[PDB]
Symmetry: D2
Subunit: 197 residues, 4 copies
């Protein structure tokens, strides 16, 4: 059906958006290491929301179900997580990214500055990037989650408890202890690395 075709196109163009941001981030990481001897980025992961998740979300909001609706109302269709070696790399990567001429900052939420009640810590920014296609240019939003390795280890276990669902409450306070415990050890590693660089 015609409606179906748009969502296939949607997956493809947002994947291209991820390619654009990944290359910028890789170049930033690589040049920081060249000038300096430190790679701010440990690894990255990319994902594009599955069409079924998009329709569900659109259904939830009571909106007309098409790809054009999806673009307008869901801005983390494309997501990239940037896992950093040290806490200062997180803020630093953001500065290096957002000062680029063709990167527009759309939304920002700093769960490192303001941790979640559960203990989740990450830096969330939505940015827009031009994507040049065969016969047009698309300016597309991309959700970038920037975090430390420890933050990433915490968030993945928490996530694995939630979706797979009564266990979350059972582990809620102990996961908060780990989020606190992970924060503390990462600032000690941060301040040792700050001193020697």
């Amino acid at each position: 059906f015609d409606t179906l075709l748009g969502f296939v196109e949607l997956d493809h163009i947002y994947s291209s958006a991820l390619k654009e941001i990944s290359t910028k981030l890789s170049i930033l990481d690589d040049n920081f290491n060249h000038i300096y001897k430190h790679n701010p980025i440990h690894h990255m992961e990319r994902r594009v929301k599955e069409m079924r998740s998009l329709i569900e979300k659109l259904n939830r909001k009571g909106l007309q179900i098409s790809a054009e609706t999806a673009k307008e109302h869901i801005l983390d269709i494309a997501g990239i997580r940037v896992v950093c070696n040290y806490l200062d790399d997180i803020y630093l990567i953001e500065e290096m990214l957002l000062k680029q001429e063709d990167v527009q900052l759309i939304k920002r939420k700093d769960y490192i500055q303001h941790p979640k009640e559960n203990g989740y810590r990450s830096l969330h920014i939505v940015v827009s990037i031009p994507v040049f296609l065969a016969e047009r240019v698309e300016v597309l939003p991309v959700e970038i989650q920037i975090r430390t390795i420890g933050m990433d280890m915490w968030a993945s276990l928490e996530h694995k408890i939630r979706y797979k669902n009564a266990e979350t409450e059972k582990y809620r306070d102990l996961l908060k202890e780990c989020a606190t415990e992970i924060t503390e050890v990462e600032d000690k590693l941060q301040q040792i690395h700050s001193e020697i660089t």
Copy 2:
């Protein structure tokens, strides 16, 4: 010190290659999504090694430094885009050059007018911005767009000149015949492919 400049040159022109690769990969994928055909067969990136920069500077009587190479050699970074069919070459060019941040610097169409020795390729030098940690660099990249068959020829011819160049005269008439025979069969394959699409 002089040597460091060339390491810097390699690094930043390699970053330029990543930027242009991503654009091309996105074009190829979008072209395929629209017309059910992948124009690009493969790509190969290369930065000219410092010894290839110096002899070219020497041949021009230029002072031997990375900044002189930067100013005077526009194929320091080169990417070969190998296409499945001859008409794909000109579609990749059109799709690339209409991007606002891609500027055409030089163009020479050895497909429209082959070299006497039989060589064919479309050469365009374009400029691309590279966003680094603490500065932006606009760098030229030489793009050689050719068919698979043109690439097989050029690789062998390139493998006649560099190793034991004296024989370049010995095979010149036979390599011209092969270039003609490759052209002939690629036009037949092009028109069979055009008819069914």
Copy 3:
């Protein structure tokens, strides 16, 4: 349940493809280190999708399950090894089949004896052990070894049959001519390459 078997089939035959890819990549690299020439131009792996397994099972009147497919279809996993020159094909075969953990199952040389329609490739089915988390599987893999030119032909011919197959008769005489013309030029390029090496 039946569906799960096929997901398992895809996964383990994909692992077989990784094992054989690594062997071939190591052979290519070592051949290059000794003789200053890379025999392999590129490779493409593919697992036949479940719909391609079922119709083949149906065509044979076989019960529709992953275990029946496993027993009766030896090209579930296929890798195409595209070589730079015709003589490289037989050297890759010899180098691969002498490995103690590679067993030849089937061989058919369409280069020595092309198909009437013009197709050429060397087909060998080999078995490879795949070491999994909790068991070892010895799985067959169909390897199609061909030159770049053979690959261009087969891709177009393959693109005549599957989409709008009626025209397969229309282009049959013209595709035969192209296969002949590709053979002729690849033997000239082979002998120029052999002489300088």
Copy 4:
């Protein structure tokens, strides 16, 4: 010089060795995730010792300097670090690897069972693997260091203090605190993950 050639060959064949082990590990990781919903491996890194480090080491031992000497006396010429998500993945990966028919265990040292005085924790195993080359098979040793993410974060900062050299003593006891602090939080994450899987 003739001696030089052997060391070039050495780098190449030990790199092939790394390719063989990487593929096995990737298949193990991927199959564990298929059967179970957990990827034991977070990431891997490969390195082959630089020729200058090999000569220095041979010089240190007062041995004749050739590639053949190097193979005999240096068994971590090829090294792969396997960074695991949880502490139990480390032991588990080892079991899955060493039960494979063509993997021979050569040496083992468990710094997780027995931490270093500084606080370093990792599992070190040297294994041998057949590498099939163009015209021979080589059974080559490979050093595999298996560790947790936290262990890897600890070890990299410690390493960055040592090579870059009076700072090591300054940070010695504080790095020991982090090694202890990292251990504690990783066993809490381990026991939460053990309970829900």
